[PDB]
Design a protein around this ligand. Structure first.
Ligand SMILES: [Ca+2]
Lengths: 557, 193
């Protein structure tokens, strides 16, 4: 999930520009819901996931807000000590404490019903138990019991009129989420929000801790500790689920790392490029980053150095020259199914081969399968979410940095061979594989493009529409599920704020009993595909001016 | 009036709610959501509470059990019970709004019932404040803030110690799953903090 916020000093013909592309997968009917709320202290416009009471993306005519997943470490596992005798008890602070339990009945359409028990300790619900060790794992969340307050902080922030009021609400959001701010005066801000544990000294947050007492968190860290910036010296704020600040520790997921190879660099490159950006230029970064190969930049120097002393008639040198001629931007051919350049196919084969010879080789089975992905995933429906640099690829980047890398190389991943020799061997594998399928003439390689699918099943894998409701887009775009832009103090208008969004397929998922589809069921689908956008209205006169219908209700509590 | 809720839809169908109080404002929101996205919302309610096997069958029993094991319903109810009346209005407003429209739908299903309820062979039930809160808890708290692989990391670490010995196993662990990496590109510049 990406975001770019541009302040006074970087903005051209406006005072502040906010562009958000939350990435949640692509669904039919839309993941988010468009809504404007005027009354009881609220005056907002925007869209929000699952029509939550609070709007994750929008503005109130004074300030604008947005979000991106935080990925801080806010969950720890407690190894609970059970006795063989005296069951449903666990040892805590030298006493055998009884567990909370609840019975549950799963009713099944056309099958027998099923019942089970859920167990809970002071640390959290029990995940799994190992009756051989006499250990049970309880999952402890720093936000346990602040779920409802997090929702309400997301709602009350819509009424803030300045940074001061806005951060009072940011302080109550307990989930690990990045929050972004912009205002009518050109002020911009960022807060890495959430509840984080105050851990015991010598607690390694990557691995379980005994739940017998000594390892129990001391409490939660204060909000003064949460990374934040207000009106940064650069004139902008960019994030693509990268580290908030220097030395901030990421989630404990084995598959998640914050290293020198990060996709946020692709955004930075573009924002530093122009001294000032207009709104169209700010919107335009969505198109470029949507189409950018993420590995080109990281490994081109490595491939260039390795093939420098090779002959022109050497196929491994040819392949690097193709990539050298390429900008990394994927474009579809006229056929709507293949890419213009073979770069991504080359990097995908090369990278898979490199991983198998280096990272995969150093890790015992079956942990070796965690590091073998190149990050070019997909099926026929294309990727289920965003494209990123794989974990194996981030670890291989540090290795190819040698001594320029801050990560001590305990095992030499190249296993005593010079780097160049492993690179050339992987390049030989690439050539052998690709030449076999497409031929020897690299210039006529017509490689398959990734596609986009608006799925009928929600993210849980549960149907939220009929299978036939599934929509397909020819070009895969590494962008938000929705994209929204807020422009404060345009010099171009009389209006103090301008805002746009796109909610595809459409606003409504309604289908009448006879099979009659709503008028707004899919009127935003083509707009999505060609990087278009629709105006978001706030004021009564704009709303009135654009009204298509009215409904008045008289209800009393 | 205080009883009045005006609903204006724009050229894209995006609803705008005009109301004088909190309960009336959230009622309006709930009402248009039930108009636009009832089947989606209903399926999102069953997904977040682990009630998919009831209407969908055998295939969702494991899903249902996994959802239920990952939360404590009673802890959620207690947070709702502790809300102030203004805070409570948002949730009650919302559920009420939705219910208003579910009553008309269930009254005149020959024209108002979402086609998919017929397809899937079930009908919409009324919502309570707990249901609204669970939509957020289940798709925001469990989707993006419930991430850990600590038991798996321990398994990996144990395998590295069996391969490189104790000290070496640990140093390889730090090369694969480092705590911090000082070269990572950051949102906040180092001059800032
Ligand atoms: Ca942890």
């Amino acid at each position: 999930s990406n975001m770019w916020v541009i302040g006074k000093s970087k903005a051209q013909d406006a005072k502040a520009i906010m562009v958000n592309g939350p990435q949640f997968g692509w669904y039919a009917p839309a993941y988010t819901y468009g809504i404007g709320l005027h009354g009881a202290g609220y005056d907002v416009t925007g869209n929000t996931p699952f029509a939550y009471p609070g709007l994750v993306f929008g503005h109130n005519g004074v300030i604008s807000w947005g979000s991106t997943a935080g990925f801080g470490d806010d969950v720890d596992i407690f190894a609970e000590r059970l006795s063989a005798e005296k069951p449903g008890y666990y040892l805590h602070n030298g006493k055998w404490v009884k567990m909370l339990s609840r019975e549950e009945t799963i009713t099944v359409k056309n099958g027998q019903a099923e019942t089970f028990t859920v167990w809970r300790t002071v640390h959290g619900n029990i995940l799994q138990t190992d009756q051989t060790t006499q250990t049970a794992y309880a999952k402890s969340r720093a936000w346990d019991g602040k779920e409802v307050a997090s929702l309400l902080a997301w709602t009350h922030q819509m009424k803030a009129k300045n940074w001061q009021e806005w951060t009072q609400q940011a302080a109550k959001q307990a989930l690990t989420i990045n929050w972004y701010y912009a205002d009518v005066n050109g002020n911009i801000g960022y807060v890495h929000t959430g509840a984080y544990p105050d851990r015991q000294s010598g607690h390694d947050p990557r691995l379980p801790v005994p739940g017998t007492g000594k390892w129990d968190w001391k409490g939660l860290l204060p909000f003064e500790m949460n990374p934040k910036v207000y009106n940064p010296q650069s004139g902008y704020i960019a994030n693509w689920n990268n580290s908030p600040q220097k030395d901030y520790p990421a989630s404990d997921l084995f598959a998640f790392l914050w290293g020198g190879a990060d996709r946020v660099t692709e955004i930075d490159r573009l924002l530093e490029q122009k001294p000032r950006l207009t709104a169209d230029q700010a919107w335009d970064v969505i198109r470029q980053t949507s189409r950018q190969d993420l590995n080109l930049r990281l490994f081109l120097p490595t491939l260039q150095a390795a093939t420098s002393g090779l002959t022109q008639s050497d196929p491994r040198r040819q392949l690097v020259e193709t990539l050298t001629r390429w900008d990394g931007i994927n474009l579809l051919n006229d056929d709507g199914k293949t890419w213009q350049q073979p770069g991504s196919a080359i990097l995908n084969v090369w990278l898979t081969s490199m991983l198998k010879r280096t990272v995969v080789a150093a890790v015992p089975m079956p942990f070796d399968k965690w590091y073998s992905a190149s990050g070019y995933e997909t099926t026929q429906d294309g990727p289920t979410g965003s494209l990123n640099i794989s974990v194996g690829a981030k670890i291989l980047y540090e290795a190819v940095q040698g001594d320029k890398s801050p990560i001590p190389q305990a095992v030499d991943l190249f296993a005593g061979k010079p780097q160049q020799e492993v690179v050339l061997a992987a390049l030989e594998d690439t050539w052998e594989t690709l030449s076999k399928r497409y031929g020897n003439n690299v210039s006529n390689w017509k490689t398959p493009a990734m596609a986009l699918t608006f799925r009928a099943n929600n993210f849980f894998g549960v149907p939220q529409a009929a299978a036939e409701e599934t929509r397909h887009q020819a070009e895969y775009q590494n962008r938000g599920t929705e994209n929204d832009m807020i422009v404060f103090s345009p010099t171009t208008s009389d209006r103090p704020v301008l805002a746009w969004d796109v909610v595809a397929p459409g606003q409504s998922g309604f289908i009448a009993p006879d099979g009659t589809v709503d008028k707004h069921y899919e009127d935003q689908l083509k707009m999505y595909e060609n990087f278009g956008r629709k105006s978001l209205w706030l004021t009564k006169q704009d709303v009135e001016a654009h009204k298509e219908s009215q409904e008045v209700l008289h209800v009393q509590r | 009036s205080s009883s009045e809720i005006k609903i204006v839809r724009d050229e894209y169908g995006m609803p705008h709610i005009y109301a004088n109080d909190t309960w009336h404002l959230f009622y309006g929101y709930g009402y248009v959501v039930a108009q636009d996205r009832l089947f989606q919302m209903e399926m999102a309610r069953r997904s977040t509470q682990g009630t998919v096997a009831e209407v969908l069958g055998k295939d969702f029993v494991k899903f249902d059990k996994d959802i239920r094991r990952n939360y404590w319903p009673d802890a959620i109810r207690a947070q709702i019970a502790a809300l102030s009346p203004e805070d409570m209005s948002i949730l009650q407003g919302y559920a009420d709004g939705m219910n208003a429209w579910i009553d008309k739908v269930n009254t005149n299903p020959e024209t108002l019932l979402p086609k998919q309820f017929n397809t899937f062979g079930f009908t919409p039930k009324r919502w309570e404040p707990f249901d609204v809160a669970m939509i957020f808890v289940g798709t925001m708290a469990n989707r993006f803030s419930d991430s850990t692989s600590e038991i798996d990391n321990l398994a990996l670490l144990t395998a590295l110690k069996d391969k490189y010995g104790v000290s070496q196993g640990m140093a390889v662990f730090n090369q694969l799953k480092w705590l911090v990496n000082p070269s990572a590109p950051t949102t906040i510049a180092v001059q800032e903090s």
